[PDB]
Scaffold this motif. Structure first.
Motif, short mmCIF file in Angstrom:
data_model
loop_
_atom_site.label_atom_id
_atom_site.label_comp_id
_atom_site.label_asym_id
_atom_site.label_seq_id
_atom_site.Cartn_x
_atom_site.Cartn_y
_atom_site.Cartn_z
N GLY A 35 22.67 4.73 -8.14
CA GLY A 35 21.71 4.80 -7.04
C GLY A 35 20.62 5.87 -7.19
N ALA A 36 20.63 6.68 -8.26
CA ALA A 36 19.69 7.79 -8.44
C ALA A 36 18.25 7.35 -8.79
CB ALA A 36 20.23 8.69 -9.55
N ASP A 37 18.09 6.15 -9.33
CA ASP A 37 16.82 5.61 -9.82
C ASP A 37 15.70 5.63 -8.76
N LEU A 38 14.53 6.15 -9.13
CA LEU A 38 13.37 6.21 -8.24
C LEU A 38 12.84 4.81 -7.87
N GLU A 39 12.83 3.86 -8.80
CA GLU A 39 12.34 2.50 -8.53
C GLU A 39 13.17 1.81 -7.44
N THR A 40 14.47 2.09 -7.34
CA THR A 40 15.34 1.65 -6.24
C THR A 40 14.90 2.22 -4.88
N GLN A 41 14.40 3.46 -4.84
CA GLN A 41 13.84 4.04 -3.61
C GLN A 41 12.49 3.37 -3.26
N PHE A 42 11.68 3.08 -4.29
CA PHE A 42 10.53 2.19 -4.17
C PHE A 42 10.94 0.79 -3.66
N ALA A 43 12.10 0.24 -4.02
CA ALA A 43 12.61 -1.03 -3.48
C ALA A 43 12.87 -0.96 -1.97
CB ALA A 43 13.82 -1.51 -4.27
N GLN A 44 13.23 0.20 -1.42
CA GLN A 44 13.26 0.40 0.04
C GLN A 44 11.85 0.30 0.66
N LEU A 45 10.84 0.95 0.07
CA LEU A 45 9.44 0.77 0.53
C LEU A 45 8.96 -0.67 0.40
N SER A 49 7.40 -3.19 3.18
CA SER A 49 6.17 -3.97 2.99
C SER A 49 6.43 -5.47 3.14
CB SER A 49 5.59 -3.74 1.59
N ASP A 50 7.55 -5.92 2.61
CA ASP A 50 7.95 -7.31 2.63
C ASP A 50 8.27 -7.73 4.06
#
Lengths: 52, 52
Positions: A35-45, A49-50
């Motif tokens: 869960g540390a990955d930054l792109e996964t935190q971008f997946a919350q954003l 947006s979605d």
């Protein structure tokens, strides 16, 4: 009661806690590393947006 | 009467007292060591709180 060498309850608690603690902690810790990955935190954003 | 080497009564009393004293004392002493725990004395206070 005083806990002689192989007192079945006390000795069993020790052997179980060795597994119980190691496994559960590994799963939490490795889960936080996965869960540390930054792109996964971008997946919350992206989910924000979605839905908006 | 005077207690010759294997006088059956006197010799039996000796052999029994060896067991009798050791076992009973072990049980009292080890029982006091098992009962020595402070949290067990707290269990007496807990029983007081529980009954009140």
């Amino acid at each position: 009661v005083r806990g002689m060498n192989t007192s079945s309850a006390m000795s069993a608690f020790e052997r179980m806690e060795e597994k119980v603690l190691m496994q559960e902690s590994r799963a939490q810790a490795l889960g936080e590393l996965a869960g540390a990955d930054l792109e996964t935190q971008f997946a919350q954003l992206e989910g924000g947006s979605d839905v908006d």
